[PDB]
Amino acid sequence: KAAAIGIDLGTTYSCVGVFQHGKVEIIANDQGNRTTPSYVAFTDTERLIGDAAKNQVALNPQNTVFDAKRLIGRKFGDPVVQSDMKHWPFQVINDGDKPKVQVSYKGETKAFYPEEISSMVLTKMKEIAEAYLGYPVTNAVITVPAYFNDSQRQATKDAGVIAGLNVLRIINEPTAAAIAYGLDRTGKGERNVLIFDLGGGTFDVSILTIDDGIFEVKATAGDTHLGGEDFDNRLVNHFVEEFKRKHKKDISQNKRAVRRLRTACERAKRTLSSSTQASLEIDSLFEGIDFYTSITRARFEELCSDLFRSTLEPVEKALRDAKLDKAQIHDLVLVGGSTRIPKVQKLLQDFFNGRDLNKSINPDEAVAYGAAVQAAILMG
């Protein structure tokens, strides 16, 4: 009787939807946000999840955990883990070749498996859904990247079970986005679909063939370390330089000032997707000095031009691997918040010689939307 939910357990943001009464609704959290940071923070007094966790990241970098999706289902000695560890402010330890994130909580050293951290994010998403529906939720579909292996899939399912969910199915992110657009509904005959997923930390291109509702992954490409965070970073460096020029002071070694500037850059970037200019207004950025400035859409595009253009070669690669021409792609689907950037849409559309882009569902919601459809299907 309770509706089942669909959860996009994102690298940087998660999203939850529900299909009922003939339609999907993506559910807003307590702050009114339709996506929620995949962040968990531990303090002297509480555990914070989502917006509350991300909103104190500058204050508490050692104990604010993110990127758990990069660890989940991996062994400590996995080269990906050993590489990624070098760039996180939190500690990762080895418990019998399994990674654990080590933090301080309520004055004590504690360590958590990645699936435990992800379970906390999942608990938040479940609670968001429950506040909207007015009752406890017990069934969910959760999504994962197409490239996830059996261990990563099981660890993700385990995160759900820890969160108190019966996991109806673990399905691929690109498949979920296809389902969102009802591309699973055609009968006999192949339909080739390209999913272009540029999120906060990763870029995934998937080519799917759908034939009578059956999905085959034909090709995957991309970069697991290219996303919106890199665009924020280009803005950060730009403004660090601007602050140096205006005040003859370098803020780069002040972790707090840099992180606060980063937050302000992410906000301005979002504004630039719908406006041609954005203002930044940081109070007491550095040594009580305020930073009140502006950024145009064109300047932002300039600062990121190589990164935006770099998304096209993985499309070329995926097409080659799938042995398909551009014209053989029936549908182009935008996934990931970064695909809201007008210049990114232009690049992809131009590459496809003027083709329609499927973008009527907010790209940062498409995966949750499809997961919610599938959850309702599996419930019957």
Ligand SMILES: Nc1ncnc2c1ncn2[C@@H]1O[C@H](COP(=O)(O)OP(=O)(O)O)[C@@H](O)[C@H]1O
């Ligand atoms: N309107 C927007 N314009 C540009 N970038 C956006 C916009 N909305 C969200 N983003 C970016 O999307 C990225 C997050 O992508 P999302 O699809 O929510 O999940 P994930 O990062 O988990 O793949 C972040 O870099 C965020 O700043």
Ligand SMILES: [Cl-]
């Ligand atoms: Cl262009």
Ligand SMILES: [K+]
């Ligand atoms: K996401």
